[PDB]
Write a protein that binds this ligand. Structure first.
Ligand SMILES: [Mg+2]
Ligand SMILES: [Zn+2]
Ligand SMILES: [Zn+2]
Lengths: 1342, 99, 83, 82
RNA sequence: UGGCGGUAGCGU
DNA sequence: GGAAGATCGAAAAAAGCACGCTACCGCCCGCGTGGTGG
DNA sequence: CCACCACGCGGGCGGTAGCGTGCTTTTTTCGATCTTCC
């Protein structure tokens, strides 16, 4: 029906063409008779008849008079729905400016006229005269004149100049300008000018003028002259069943506008004085501005009960606006809501449904089936039969929902698993019965949770929910690929109890012929479930060709494991169930079954596991009693000795031997050690303290205690919870965050006094408040993430790109946080993988790396793999399947048409609840055994032969004997080395040492040191030491340096026996070590030193959800680390007064880089060092924009991914890097031109990267030289707002500004996206509908 | 609370809300995002137009279901028409370009 | 009944056109008065189409071939009737 | 106009002092021989000609029939101005 | 049987 | 040696602040002016 | 002759003034230096 949406401003003539009449009276509806007045806000003649095919006068009241108008009253006999489309118009007495185009920063009118917004505000509201005709006088074209100035000019010059007031003057100024000559002059000035801010202003004005001239709109249309009026049905007067009507705010605002316009017309008809006319015009302008957008300027119009009125713009933007309340989401029919309970008998694809609730939901289907069966002949009869609830109605209900899936959804839909398709099973009751296994997917607890149900009502929706959103098809989390359907609480405990071995259980030592005999013995009560026996069992192994071979053998196991072996499928080996079978063991068994057997047996295995676990947990009868939590006998001795130690420390402090801070720290450490000892003793007394009398003697075995069984199996609780159960509660934190000296030494089994409870309440209150105020932040973050990547779908297969990320396992300190296996599995390679040292193709160029390939690459001890990434996907308007990788939810590669962006956004946003918002070295240690490598190192030998590095970015790698990088550390510059490179070392040894408090100056040459180019009292001072008293030189900074000595920069020169400065070996100029501020030198004049000696001494939360938000929004670190833009030497220029000027002087290239550095900011580099591109110059965090500009897209992508992964791993949540890579790619979507080239893009233009790439490719194909572009990193909010499709930006937020931009520029929006297609109401271009869309695209090919 | 069909809003032509008003459950933005995550296109489209706003679509769906035919006419949601009318009343032209 | 459609998905091979072809077959059966090629056991049209797809009897290419053959048969019949 | 209150020049005051107008007043224009719309009574929605004020309560119009217009006086509230 | 504003509560 | 570009911090204005659901309360122009019934 | 059922033009409300007042982040402007020169 249509292909695109055109957005622009409306001309007054076409606005008049829109209207079917003119509203001239403020009356809306007469209260005596419910009929509108003539020319009113609800007039029938202007808009339409109030009743279908009925004249207002009543002369014609039948369908036969359709299409004709009446003469008694002048209304048309049509449908009432026409009142929802016809709009009115009001002819304003004087032109009024549009508030949207005037107040929305930047002011379009002010920027177009090139004048400050204050002058526009003054002239618009009748405060200062503005000139229109400059004439031959001294007055220019646009000049601001006050009343006195205007009178003086009028006296001086008569009619030579024209000056005016109000919006009429603005309209005259807009109409009296030429866009072509203005834009040509602006372009010429921009070419001639050189100021950067002037260049940017001229560029933006040129862009605005070009956009205006390109479209058919004209500037004078920006000042309203005819005011449109909404159709009456969109501002209805709902009856109040009390003789009154509820007038909407729009009706009140329209009444105000009409009254003010009528008053102004009457006043100007009477030839009112100038002051009164100006006041009336200002009042009309204020009323129009309030109606268009209330509250933008001055005071908002108050309501009846002292509230701001709802204007036209108020119902477009905001959460309650039409976009986010009735367009993105809407209420739907065939839906229900009810509480949820647990049904253990249900299958994985089945859910319970109440009979009455299903009858209400499936009413039309029952009506249709009843009509087909002949029971009822009309809708009324079927409705009566349904409401009477006959047996035939229930039979029809059973028939119609045999295989009709229903969508079950929960209120906090974080990820796609929150809504799933289930087959309904009719039950008698009032609560929906949910499958226990899917609860973890729903994150729902049967503690009052309410869930909603929707009924798909077409073949496409039914089949698509059966095939895609069914619970059986959703077993792997799209976020990380880990299984979701796993036993959680009762099944795990039941299986752990079942697969547990005693020592002297009944029936131990017997021999059984198979699992059937074991089951029949257990049911008969002839042998205990924990008895250790030997059973002859046959297990099936999957052959290489794809067959099952049965091997029979005798295994020493338990009766419970033999019973469990029944439900295990043939392919799985017996070793999985021959253990304690904890929760992780069950999860591993399920994952192995899914990998080997597939999907069809996996659901059956899960159902059987759940049934067996529930049944045997019921049979076991595990219970919690007051005797279960045992109090250690040694606890009171530990408490007494800790108290005695604390008392003796306190009495020592009373003597003054130890200060308050040290004694506080010692007390805290002692209490922590005592708590750890008590917890360890309790755990030892609880784990294996069960002494069982085996035949002959006693023996120690794992305890069958209910608490220990229930916690060790992983069903519920953890080590800390058990520690709170039996051990002391430990130390607690006060509201500020510090630790309290006296901990809680009372268990939960024993009583707690008032003081301990009051102390402990702080943490609980803080956690509850944090969760309550963190839910909103998580929701906002996930909304922004979803919007940012709502238009990224796979629409290709292979770009042919040979560029990829240099993926390696992450090393941080002395541990391997994440190896290569998890960070590479389910991804494709960017190029061929070469075996280390053989140059052999281990992996082909474009082969997906599954488990087998991962094992093959890990067996060769490879660490560096180049893998294709989404950020490197060359495909425009989407990404390719190969450049993305594995689907992460299915075993195959991701299919075309999938919405990867929404998947990524939901995966990143789901752990928002788990995060937190609370705000609260001198040597290198070796842990493992391996050789040491050094990177980015320039080291020299010291006096004693030790090695000292002269590089600031030196990195040491501890690599095992297999060539794999095990550990990595960043050694500070100028650190002494105990051992050299390439020497194997053992754990616990120290290789490098340095002083963190202050840094010593390193000398790379050997010779004498003299006191040169510095004078005491001008540049340095010969200060006496506080203790030693030696005359040490201290360098004075520029602030205290004398004027005469300003040019005498201190610099120590190493000299030989001759006395002249020794040149650096292999370097022309001599070694002149610069002296920075606060430099302390101890050696005296003419001191002999060697290479590597120490010359001078120089002295020297962000986590959780806020950290993620700062990383995503590209927030400035507030203390950026200065980076070297170009590679070259460093020099110091003029000091100016507040900031030092540093000059970068490349050896070969020019020296255009001069950078201002704050004086108080520490400088890592001295005067005589060599640095490369992207080198750290000052301490602090690195801004993402600087990283992108200097080190490239790959480096900033890696930094963001690493930071996000570290933040998530700190909280214990694992997320694949594909989602972060997709988000980062969505971040980098804008490019700014540098060289115009043959393209038509402006020098300062910032446009889409895809458009630049397409233009460059077209120019290269033609043969002309392309343009040069630089990628820009814009925050997620800015990136989402600055998009081609203005509909998505308008729906997001800041609707006024984006709508104004779209109206001014005359943008044309093709849908080509998900959110806009959803808003319009068509099939989305993602998933199934994508295919259809593709067909449509080919139909546009011809 | 369960609803198959009932009274609709007189301004947005959408089902009412609340049990006391015999309304329908709200399909929020997160539900739409989850549907798009599954690749749900036909289900989302039928939940967006033929169930809530498209009056002609709703009537056609009811007649087809009574007749035993499961087919959907997307039509045109009335919320978008309302939004277009409000934007037009703001003095800003918006229209659907057929070409 | 069809608890899972993994094998049908791998038969189609993409999991998205499978929904389209199954919906087309279901619409053909329900309102076109067609006769399924697979015996039915009190089952709905959708699962019947899925079971037909299971054995490869129904696929996009063969369905299009059958549609074209039916169209040419009906046009030949109507031309013969007119002439 | 602005922060400070406006000051009206003495010339405007002088003009207003000698301001002795004669006006018709738009919404109160039931003048003799003038077009007036009756929206109530037996002649609702009909255009007629006010021709003389009959007393005060019931002004007099040439009420328009299908054939012609006839002298008749009816209540003032029945008809408004066109 | 329509809306809001305030209050309180449920599930997160 | 005064005027224009720099900039620079300091201040001011705009937009956002999760999702569903339930129940209750209050209101659905106020006010000077006017005519009519107890 | 006094209480109370419409009513139809204005707009912050009320008063011979004043009322407001426990956020953060982003964007724009502006006085004040400054600084840099032609
Ligand atoms: Mg709960
Ligand atoms: Zn009529
Ligand atoms: Zn690609």
């Amino acid at each position: 029906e249509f292909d695109a949406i055109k957005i622009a401003l409306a001309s007054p003539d076409m606005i008049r063409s829109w209207s079917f009449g003119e509203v001239k009276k403020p009356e809306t509806i007469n209260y005596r008779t419910f009929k509108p007045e003539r020319d009113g806000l609800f007039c029938a003649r202007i808009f339409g008849p109030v009743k279908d095919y009925e004249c207002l006068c009543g002369k014609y009241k039948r369908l036969k008079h359709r299409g004709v108008i009446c003469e008694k009253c002048g209304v048309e006999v049509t449908q009432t729905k026409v009142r929802r489309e016809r709009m009115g118009h009001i002819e304003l007495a004087s032109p009024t400016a549009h508030i949207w185009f005037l107040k929305s920063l930047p002011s379009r009118i002010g920027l177009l006229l090139d004048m400050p917004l204050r002058d526009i505000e003054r002239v618009l509201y009748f405060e200062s005269y503005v000139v229109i005709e400059g004439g031959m006088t001294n007055l220019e074209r646009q000049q601001i004149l006050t009343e006195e100035q205007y009178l003086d000019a009028l006296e001086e010059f008569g009619d030579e100049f024209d000056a005016k007031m109000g919006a009429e003057a603005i309209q005259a100024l807009l109409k009296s300008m030429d866009l072509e000559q203005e834009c040509e002059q602006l372009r010429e000035e921009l070419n001639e000018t050189n100021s950067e801010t002037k260049r940017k202003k001229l560029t933006k004005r040129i862009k605005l003028l070009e956009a205006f001239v390109q479209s058919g709109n004209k500037p004078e249309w920006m000042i309203l002259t005819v005011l449109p009026v909404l159709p009456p049905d969109l501002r209805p007067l709902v009856p109040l069943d009390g003789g009154r009507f509820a007038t909407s705010d729009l009706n009140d605002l329209y009444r105000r506008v009409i009254n003010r316009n009528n008053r102004l017309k009457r006043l100007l008809d009477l030839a009112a004085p100038d002051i009164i006319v100006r006041n009336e015009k200002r009042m009309l302008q204020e009323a129009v501005d309030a109606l268009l957008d209330n509250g933008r300027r001055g005071r908002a119009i108050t309501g009846s009960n002292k509230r701001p009125l709802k204007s036209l713009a108020d119902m477009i933007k905001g959460k309650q606006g039409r976009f986010r309340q009735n367009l993105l989401g809407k209420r739907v029919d065939y839906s229900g809501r009810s509480v949820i309970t647990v049904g253990p008998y249900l299958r994985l694809h089945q859910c319970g449904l109440p009979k009455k609730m299903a009858l209400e939901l499936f009413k039309p289907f029952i009506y249709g089936k009843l009509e087909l069966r002949g029971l009822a002949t009309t809708i009324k009869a079927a409705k009566k039969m349904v409401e009477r609830e006959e047996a035939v109605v229930w039979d029809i209900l059973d028939e119609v929902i045999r295989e009709h899936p229903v969508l079950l959804n929960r209120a906090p839909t974080l990820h796609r698993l929150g809504i799933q398709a289930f087959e309904p099973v009719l039950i008698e009751g009032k609560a929906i019965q949910l499958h226990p296994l899917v609860c973890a997917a729903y994150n729902a607890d049967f503690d009052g949770d309410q869930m909603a149900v929707h009924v798909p009502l077409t073949l496409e929706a039914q089949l698509e929910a059966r095939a895609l959103m069914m619970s059986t098809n959703n077993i792997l989390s799209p976020a990380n690929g880990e299984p979701i359907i796993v036993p959680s609480q009762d099944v795990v405990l039941g299986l752990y109890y079942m697969t547990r071995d005693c020592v002297n259980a009944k029936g131990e030592g017997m021999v059984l012929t198979g699992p059937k005999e074991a089951e029949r013995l257990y049911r008969s009560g002839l042998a205990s479930l924990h008895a250790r026996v030997k059973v002859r069992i046959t297990e099936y192994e999957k052959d290489a060709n794809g067959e099952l071979v049965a091997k029979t053998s005798l295994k020493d196991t338990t009766v419970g494991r033999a019973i469990l072996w029944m439900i295990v499928p043939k392919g799985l080996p017996y070793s999985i169930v021959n253990q304690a079978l904890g929760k992780k063991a069950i999860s591993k068994m399920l994952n192995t079954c899914y990998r080997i057997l597939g999907l069809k047996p996996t659901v059956i295995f899960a159902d059987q596991i759940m049934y067996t676990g529930f049944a045997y947990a019921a049979r076991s009868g595990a219970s919690v009693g007051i005797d279960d939590m045992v109090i250690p006998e040694k606890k009171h001795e530990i408490i007494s000795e800790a108290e005695a130690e604390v008392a003796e420390i306190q009495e020592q402090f009373q003597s003054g031997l130890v200060t308050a801070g040290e004694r506080y720290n010692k007390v805290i450490d002692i209490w922590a050690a005592a708590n750890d000892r008590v917890s360890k003793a309790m755990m030892d007394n609880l784990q294996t303290e069960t002494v069982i009398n085996r035949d002959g003697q006693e023996e120690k075995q794992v305890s069958f205690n209910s608490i220990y069984m229930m916690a060790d199996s992983g069903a519920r609780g953890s080590a800390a919870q058990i520690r709170q159960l039996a051990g002391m509660r430990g130390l607690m934190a006060k509201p500020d965050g510090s630790i309290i000296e006296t901990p809680i030494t009372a268990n939960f089994r024993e009583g707690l006094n008032v003081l301990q409870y009051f102390i402990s309440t702080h943490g609980a209150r803080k956690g509850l408040a944090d969760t309550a105020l963190k839910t909103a932040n998580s929701g906002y973050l996930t909304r922004r993430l979803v919007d940012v990547a709502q238009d990224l779908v796979v629409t290709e297969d292979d770009c042919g790109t040979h560029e990829g990320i240099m993926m390696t396992p992450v090393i941080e300190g002395g541990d391997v946080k994440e190896p290569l296996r998890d960070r590479v599995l389910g991804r494709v390679t960017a190029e061929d993988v070469l075996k280390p040292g053989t140059a052999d193709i281990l992996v082909p160029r474009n082969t997906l790396l599954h488990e087998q390939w991962c094992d093959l690459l890990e067996e060769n001890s490879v660490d560096a793999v180049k893998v294709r990434s989404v950020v490197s996907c060359d495909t425009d308007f989407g990404v390719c399947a190969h450049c993305y990788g594995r689907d992460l939810a299915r075993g195959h590669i991701i299919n075309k048409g999938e919405a990867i962006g929404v998947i990524a956004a939901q995966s990143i946003g789901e752990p928002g609840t788990q995060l937190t918002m609370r705000t609260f070295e001198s040597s290198i240690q070796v842990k493992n055994k391996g050789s040491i490598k050094l990177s980015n190192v320039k080291s020299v030998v010291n006096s004693s032969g030790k090695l000292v590095i002269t590089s600031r970015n030196t990195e040491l790698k501890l690599i095992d004997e297999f060539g794999r990088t095990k550990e990595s550390y960043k050694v500070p510059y100028g650190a002494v080395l105990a051992k050299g490179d390439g020497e194997q070392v053992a754990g616990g040894e120290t290789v490098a040492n340095w002083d963190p408090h202050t840094m010593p100056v390193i000398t790379e040459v050997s010779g004498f040191v003299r006191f040169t180019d510095m004078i005491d009292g001008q540049t340095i001072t010969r200060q006496t030491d506080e203790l030693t008293g030696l005359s040490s030189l201290v360098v004075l900074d520029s602030a205290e340096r004398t004027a005469g000595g300003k040019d005498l920069r201190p610099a120590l020169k190493i000299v030989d026996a001759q006395g002249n400065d020794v040149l650096i070996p292999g370097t022309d100029m001599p070694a002149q070590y610069f002296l920075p501020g606060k430099a302390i030198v101890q050696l005296e004049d003419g001191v002999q030193i060697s290479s590597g000696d120490t010359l001078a001494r120089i002295p020297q939360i962000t986590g959780g959800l806020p950290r993620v938000a700062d990383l995503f929004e590209a927030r400035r670190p507030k203390e950026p680390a200065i980076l070297a833009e170009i590679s070259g030497i460093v020099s110091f220029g003029k000091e100016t007064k507040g900031k030092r000027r540093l000059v970068i002087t490349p050896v070969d290239g020019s020296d255009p880089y001069e950078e201002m550095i704050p004086k108080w900011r520490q400088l890592n580099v001295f005067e005589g060092e060599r640095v490369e591109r992207g080198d750290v110059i000052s301490d602090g965090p690195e801004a993402p924009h600087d990283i992108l500009r200097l080190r490239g897209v790959h480096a900033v992508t890696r930094y963001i991914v690493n930071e996000v992964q570290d933040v998530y791993r700190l909280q214990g949540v694992k997320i694949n890097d594909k989602h972060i890579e997709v988000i980062v790619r969505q971040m980098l979507r804008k490019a700014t031109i540098v060289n115009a080239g043959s393209s038509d893009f402006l020098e300062g233009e910032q446009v889409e990267y895809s458009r630049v790439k397409i233009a460059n490719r077209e120019l290269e194909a033609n043969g002309k030289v392309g343009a040069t572009y630089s990628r820009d990193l814009l925050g997620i909010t800015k990136a989402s707002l600055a998009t081609e499709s203005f509909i998505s930006a308008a729906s997001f937020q800041e609707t006024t500004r984006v709508l104004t931009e779209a109206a001014v520029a005359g943008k044309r929006d093709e849908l080509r996206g998900l959110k806009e297609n959803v808003i319009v109401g068509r099939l989305i271009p993602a998933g199934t509908g994508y295919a259809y869309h593709q067909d449509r695209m080919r139909r546009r090919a011809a | 609370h369960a609803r198959s069909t009932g009274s609709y809003s007189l301004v947005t032509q959408q089902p009412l809300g609340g049990k006391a008003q015999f309304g329908g459950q709200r399909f929020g933005e997160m539900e739409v995002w989850a549907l798009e995550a599954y690749g749900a296109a036909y289900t989302l489209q039928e939940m967006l137009t033929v169930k809530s706003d498209d009056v002609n679509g709703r009537t056609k769906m009811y007649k087809n279901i009574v007749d035993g035919n499961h087919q959907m006419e997307p039509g045109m949601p009335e919320s978008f028409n309302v939004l277009l009318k409000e934007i037009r009343s703001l003095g800003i032209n918006i229209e659907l370009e057929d070409e | 009944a069809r608890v899972t459609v993994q094998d049908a998905v791998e038969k189609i091979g993409n999991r998205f056109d499978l929904v389209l072809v199954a919906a087309r077959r279901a619409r053909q059966m329900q309102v076109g008065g067609k006769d399924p090629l697979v015996p039915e056991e009190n089952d709905k049209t959708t699962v019947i189409a899925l079971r037909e797809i299971e054995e490869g009897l129904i696929n996009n290419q063969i369905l299009d071939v059958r549609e074209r053959q039916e169209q040419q048969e009906q046009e030949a019949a109507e031309l013969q009737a007119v002439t | 106009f602005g922060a400070s209150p406006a000051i009206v020049p003495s010339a405007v005051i002088h003009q207003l002092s000698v301001y002795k107008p004669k006006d018709i007043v738009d919404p109160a224009t039931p003048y003799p021989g003038d077009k007036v719309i009756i929206t109530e009574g037996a002649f609702e929605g009909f255009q007629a000609i006010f021709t003389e004020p009959d007393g005060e309560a019931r002004s007099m119009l040439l009420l328009n029939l299908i054939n012609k217009e006839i002298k008749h006086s009816v209540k003032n509230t029945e008809f408004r101005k066109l």
